[PDB]
Amino acid sequence: ASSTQKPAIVQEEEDLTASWTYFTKLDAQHTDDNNLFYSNIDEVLFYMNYRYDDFKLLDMDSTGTKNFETILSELWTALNGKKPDYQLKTMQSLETDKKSSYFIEEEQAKHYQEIKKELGYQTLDDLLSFPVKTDALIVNKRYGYDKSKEKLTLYQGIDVLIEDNQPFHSPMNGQIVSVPDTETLVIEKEKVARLTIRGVNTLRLTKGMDVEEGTFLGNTKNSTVTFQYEKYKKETKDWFFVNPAFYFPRVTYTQTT
Amino acid sequence: ASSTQKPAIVQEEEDLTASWTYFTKLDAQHTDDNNLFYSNIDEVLFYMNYRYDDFKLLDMDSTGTKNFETILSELWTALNGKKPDYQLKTMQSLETDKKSSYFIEEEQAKHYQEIKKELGYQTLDDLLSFPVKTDALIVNKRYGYDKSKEKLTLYQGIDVLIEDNQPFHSPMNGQIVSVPDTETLVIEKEKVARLTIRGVNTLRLTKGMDVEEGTFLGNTKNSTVTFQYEKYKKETKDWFFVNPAFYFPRVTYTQTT
């Protein structure tokens, strides 16, 4: 009862990444010559999971009249406003506005923040260990949509900054299933998860070799490493991309509004 | 990047509708007493966007000798043949002809089709929600040109099949800016988008009312509802029609060759 605590994130993994991506679509579509949007989508997703539990983008709200894409779009407007004179608010601000739809009562909000901090995304399956000694990966290109060369583009991974060719250890246990070139490897846990790593020297690795979490793979080749992460969907015997950032202990985003 | 994915639709919205409309002009011009053409223009547009990115009808192709109107006209002939013995083909079939300018290697064809399924037109701005509970609007009169009375006509909207006397909810957030008659309303998101709805009784509705996505507007009068949708061009301070079908989650076209 009061001894029972729901996790900070309860959505299924595919829906969690889909909801992230939907919000990056709204950021990217409003990004133009005069405005660059990189909302704090983590704060959005923690709020949405607290309010709406294990929602899917096409489920209906409590009125029965709108789906969660619409709810997310309305939230985007509450945070960022509209052309020409956009606004910039935080989720915390909306959650403390007593007239707002997003309001959370003072005492409940203390508990909500504690659980968000204590549990985070660490209840997801198939978490990834840091590949270097650090307290947070610095993410200079987040997952999802953005504008690049004035054009909408979907980035199905994350770019991370790794200084000084640090020795790079595997984030996951699995088998090396592909070594396409000298700087790309694919590690797969059969029918579970698949991690693609770009930017690490692969000279001491061949297809079929088993690696464990922490196995040294090689030194980082330049300053950026790219991760892509996929989960397996038994129902259709295929794979879907997930946002890798959710699966490491902590990241720091360098792109912000 | 291998981690970078372009959308299924890359064209600007005005160019996308203009390309649709051009193809409907070709279908309508060749429709006669013995042949009625309603090509699968969605398949055309997804192929063209994959092959030629954010093209405009009057742009020249890479050879510099033909514009995209000419390319679309040549494709119509490849898909449909010529008088007096028309022969219907599919876009996917044309992509396997190694002697044709439409060839796409098998893997890339499968991949762009998968992206078409995942993304569709959902990367366009200012999407519309279904006005009733459904997985697809049945469109029995599509946007663009057709023949009526052996006369060419341009239809700047779509007609959708909805059961008569059924509750109808708003596809869009905005203000009711016009209530012309007891069966017509116009909703405007100011200087963004304008939605005309014909066939919903508007007696509970007044000019100046705010609506959200999902707001009950009224019950349907007849067995179809007509939508028109316009976007705003700040450069000229005017509006232009777009094909409304692109903006809903899914449609089913009843008019086929």
Residue numbers in the entry:
A (entry chain A): 273 to 529
B (entry chain B): 1 to 257
The authors write:
Therefore, we directed our efforts toward the extracytoplasmic region (PrgKEC), as well as its individual LytM, SLT, and CHAP domains. Crystallization trials yielded crystals of the PrgKLytM domain, which were used to solve the LytM structure to 1.5 Å. In agreement with bioinformatic predictions, our crystal structure confirms that the active site of LytM is degenerate as it lacks the conserved HXXXD and HXH motifs required for zinc ion coordination at the catalytic site. This is not the only characterized LytM domain with a degenerate active site. Sequence alignment of PrgKLytM homologs shows very low sequence identity, with only the region encompassing the HXXXD and HXH motifs being conserved. The His and Asp residues that are important for catalysis are only conserved in active homologs, but not in PrgKLytM and other degenerate homologs. The crystal structure of LytM superimposes well onto the AF model with an r.m.s.d. of 0.43 Å. Only one structural homolog was found in the PDB by using Foldseek, which is the geneproduct 13 (gp13) cell-wall degrading enzyme of bacteriophage Φ29 (54). gp13 consists of two domains, one N-terminal lysozyme-like domain that is homologous to the MUR domain (RMSD of 1.5 Å), and a C-terminal LytM domain (RMSD to PrgKLytM of 2.4 Å). However, the muropeptide profiles of the PrgKSLT-CHAP:C766A, H828A and PrgKEC:C766A, H828A fractions after incubation with cell-wall extract are similar to their wild-type counterparts. In line with this result, the LytM and CHAP domains showed no activity against the sacculi. In conclusion, the LytM domain of PrgK has a degenerate active site and might play a regulatory role.
